[PDB]
A paper describes a structure:
Polyethylene glycol (PEG) is a water-soluble, low immunogenic and biocompatible polymer formed by repeating units of ethylene glycol. In this regard, we have developed monoclonal antibodies that can bind specifically to PEG for universal detection and quantification of PEGylated drugs by anti-PEG sandwich enzyme-linked immunosorbent assay (ELISA). In this study, we determined the crystal structures of two PEG-specific Fab and one nonspecific Fab in complex with PEG. Both specific Fab/PEG complexes share a similar dimeric binding mode that is very different from that of the nonspecific complex.
In comparison, the refined model of 32D6-Fab in the trigonal crystal shows much larger conformational difference from those of 3.3-Fab and 2B5-Fab, with RMSD of 2.28 Å – 2.48 Å for 356–366 matched pairs of Cα atoms. It contains two bound PEG molecules. One is bound to the N-terminal side but shows a different disposition on the protein surface with a different conformation from those in the 3.3-Fab and 2B5-Fab crystals. The other is bound to the central cavity of 32D6-Fab, far away from the CDRs. On the other hand, the N-terminally bound PEG molecule to the Fv region in the 32D6-Fab crystal adopts a rather extended conformation. It is much more exposed to the solvent, and makes contacts to three different Fab molecules related by crystallographic lattice symmetry. The PEG molecule interacts with the first Fab mainly via van der Waals contacts with at least five heavy-chain residues and two light-chain residues. The four aromatic side chains of Y35(H), Y52(H), Y102(H) and Y109(H) are most involved, with a possible hydrogen bond formation between the hydroxyl group of Y109(H) and an oxygen atom of the PEG. The PEG molecule bound to the elbow region of 32D6-Fab also shows an extended conformation, which fits into a shallow groove at the interface of heavy chain and light chain. The residues that are in contact with the bound PEG include Q41(H), V94(H), F96(H), G117(H) and L119(H) from the VH domain, E159(H) and P160(H) from the CH1 domain, and Q39(L), R40(L), P41(L), G42(L), K43(L) and D90(L) from the VL domain.
Numbering used by the authors:
A (entry chain H): 1 to 238
B (entry chain L): 2 to 217
Write the structure that this text describes.
Amino acid sequence: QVQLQESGPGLVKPSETLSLTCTVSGGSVNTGSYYWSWIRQPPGKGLEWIAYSSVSGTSNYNPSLKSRVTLTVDTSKNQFSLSVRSVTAADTAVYFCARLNYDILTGYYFFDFWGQGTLVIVSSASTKGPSVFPLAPSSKSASGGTAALGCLVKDYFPEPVTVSWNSGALTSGVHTFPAVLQSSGLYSLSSVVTVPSSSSGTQTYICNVNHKPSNTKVDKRVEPKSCDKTHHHHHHHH
Amino acid sequence: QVELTQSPSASASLGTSVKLTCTLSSGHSTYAIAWHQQRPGKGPRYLMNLSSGGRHTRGDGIPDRFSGSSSGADRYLIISSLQSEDEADYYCQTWDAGMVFGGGTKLTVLGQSKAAPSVTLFPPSSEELQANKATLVCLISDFYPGAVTVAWKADSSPVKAGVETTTPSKQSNNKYAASSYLSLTPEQWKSHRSYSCQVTHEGSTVEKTVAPTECS
């Protein structure tokens, strides 16, 4: 029932101080034979333990990081926080919080609950919010009885971007693709939903895009139409 | 201090048993460890702890096909009947002056059925065209194994400039997906009769085609 969740910025500049916070549910950062720990994982690489501490003030550090890191525990909010001073690109990583359990039955120490991780990019590059464009299928692609409608989330930096449809009420037939990293250094991704070619006029499709580093939060209405928007007037076959 | 040595890769077939190895450094062969599993894009999951004598204790909710054993300085994770959701990175973990991780082992699960790709090709939106840009979007899904090559054509001529294509990665349904993007000017888009996205997978090819005369 113990759950942990990281929060922090997605992009920081070299030489800044990074601050992350873990919020714990279903357990208390004040009680038990636990330490509260941070671990990171540079993209494509392994897990690296950072430090842990207890409300009682006992703490322990990775030697190579000990002089750059500060850990605090906030019992009032059931949270604990990491600070990492003077970051460089070497500190780009997904950061995980974790509960470190001391098991009295064995004498062992092991992380028994983990957070989901938060990506932190360390870069001098500026953030860049995406443009969001509706993706309308060709009529031929729709002629089989189902069709893909979508949103193109174009030219953003850094990862990640979240996409939902109709604020999360629409999930069946939704596929959000991994982003491409283009030669420009900017990302693009596409998200589509499969819908019946049938009526569709009786349907609302809104792609909810969120890019937190640029505070780009957009709800884009996608018309349930092919790329030929005039077909219900001219009645032509394309 | 203590170090954990893991080989970075392993691969095995669905339904077999797999044994992964973690090796303790010199002077630490008496040490106990824990095993953690990390599925793609997820946080790790604690699996079990394991004594130097080979006694293991699973975490809560961990299937009984996961077990552990030991031999000298080596510590083993044994997966009895490999499942597709076992495809993951596996980290051993111990403790000394501080907490210690092995480098991880990426386990690739083999044996799923081959599957040809499905291809969806989108013309540029009117909105993007009005912003004086144009992007063709070719989406490639549900294929296995995960290697494809993508080729674009303007009418019948190959197009190489303006093409950006992802490396395939596995999706929720355990099949690979990939994307390719062709950047054009609106003039280029309206100048040709058609554009095509052609996907080659295991020697076989699937092509989709869009045309500015299809949209209005």
